[PDB]
Design a protein around this ligand. Sequence first.
Ligand SMILES: *[C@@H]1O[C@H](CO[C@@H]2O[C@@H](C)[C@@H](O)[C@@H](O)[C@@H]2O)[C@@H](O[C@@H]2O[C@H](CO)[C@@H](O[C@@H]3O[C@H](CO)[C@@H](O)[C@H](O[C@H]4O[C@H](CO)[C@@H](O)[C@H](O)[C@@H]4O)[C@@H]3O)[C@H](O)[C@H]2NC(C)=O)[C@H](O)[C@H]1NC(C)=O
Ligand SMILES: *[C@@H]1O[C@H](CO)[C@@H](O[C@@H]2O[C@H](CO)[C@@H](O)[C@H](O)[C@H]2NC(C)=O)[C@H](O)[C@H]1NC(C)=O
Length: 424
Amino acid sequence: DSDGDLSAMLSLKKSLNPPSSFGWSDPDPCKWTHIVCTGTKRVTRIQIGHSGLQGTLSPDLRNLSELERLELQWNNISGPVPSLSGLASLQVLMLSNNNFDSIPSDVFQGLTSLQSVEIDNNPFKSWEIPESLRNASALQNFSANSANVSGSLPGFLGPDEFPGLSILHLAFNNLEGELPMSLAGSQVQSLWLNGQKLTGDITVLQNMTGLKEVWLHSNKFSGPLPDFSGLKELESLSLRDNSFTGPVPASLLSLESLKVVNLTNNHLQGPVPVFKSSVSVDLDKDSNSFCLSSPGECDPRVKSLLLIASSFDYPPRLAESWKGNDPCTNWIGIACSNGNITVISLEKMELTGTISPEFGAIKSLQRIILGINNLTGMIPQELTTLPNLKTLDVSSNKLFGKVPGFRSNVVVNTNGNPDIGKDK
Ligand SMILES: *[C@@H]1O[C@H](CO[C@@H]2O[C@@H](C)[C@@H](O)[C@@H](O)[C@@H]2O)[C@@H](O[C@@H]2O[C@H](CO)[C@@H](O[C@@H]3O[C@H](CO)[C@@H](O)[C@H](O[C@H]4O[C@H](CO)[C@@H](O)[C@H](O)[C@@H]4O)[C@@H]3O)[C@H](O)[C@H]2NC(C)=O)[C@H](O)[C@H]1NC(C)=O
Ligand SMILES: *[C@@H]1O[C@H](CO)[C@@H](O[C@@H]2O[C@H](CO)[C@@H](O)[C@H](O)[C@H]2NC(C)=O)[C@H](O)[C@H]1NC(C)=O
């Protein structure tokens, strides 16, 4: 009630200790500068950003039951952020750019009206995004850049609990682990996750069709680029300084909405991408694994090997090795005679995926050695059309199906494939 608000405001004045000329002098805090109250003397707004404040924040803040907007940003307030639990009308919370040293796990408990949270640039002790946030079903904006956020990106941030989430900014924290698949379906429009140690692939982006701005640079993301054709509002895509593999997808190259793309410093393969003239492209020379230094089709041998790599799920070691346009110099697993590929030898490379029928297109092949990997599927019939093939070793994989009929002088070894001959 109004007496409770009066007491809480007096406690806040004491903790913050504002200057004598700040205007918190009247016996009725509803008459104080930068405070808004209802006609029945309930506090609804406290708006004292950029006010040079130096104290701490009283825990009695949580007693202001009708508080809607709390702005304390760009001061020098220290100590812990008090629990705000129970402030069911709090709609806007701005604490960015202060000196807060911690934020508690129950801080968002029962904050059902919360729409916008900004707590960037505070020297918080390490903390994880808390479960208490899950009651903010109308949450639209959550910003906590440079706030020492740790752990994984929690899956509860998906549309199942945050159907209105629009801005999620968590740059320059300590996040690790992979993107949770529960983000699928999210209507987030601006996503900042740059500048930490996130890993895994970014396939979940395919299911986030409201994205306009995606900043994932400076992480440890890997794997090939996903299908972008569904992201018809995507304007700004920053993927630089990661470990992405595979080619730049045509689905991205033809995306009409695209305005800015950053691809520098990855392990992207295939031909150099050509974007529309209107797109600002950040792609430093020699900062990926493209076959040429400028746009143009790759060498025929390279094209074949890249199809083979694709079927092997773009092996990370090959993405970093198979650079340039000459497979006969310094490529993992590749030997040549007079420029013709004679050996593809990738034993013990933890390969996944399947054996591409494109092996059959490399007519100079003498040895295909793929033993001790995690390959599945069948041995393609196309391999029997290799007239110089001497040895096919596919030992110790997870292959199945009938072995096609090879010439009677081809050495074939399927040792250690328990399902060879079985159908699946
Ligand atoms: C957070 O919000 C949940 C509901 O949202 C769901 O969980 C969130 C964490 C998040 O995942 C959301 O996306 C998701 O939709 C609230 O949960 C509801 O809480 C109320 C009570 O607080 C429950 O109401 C009770 O229902 C009982 C039957 O299931 C019923 O027996 C109870 O009646 C008894 O109590 C009432 C008074 O409360 C009394 O009037 C009755 O006479 C009787 O004794 C009562 O109605 C809902 O079942 C919960 N689930 C819903 C609504 O889906 C949760 O409270 C909230 N928590 C915080 C901290 O804000
Ligand atoms: C992503 O690339 C864009 C386009 O190159 C970068 O934006 C440009 O930044 C330069 C500064 O280096 C500005 O002077 C240009 O005006 C910007 N162009 C824009 C915004 O269209 C952007 O900085 C890159 N992002 C990262 C994280 O490196």
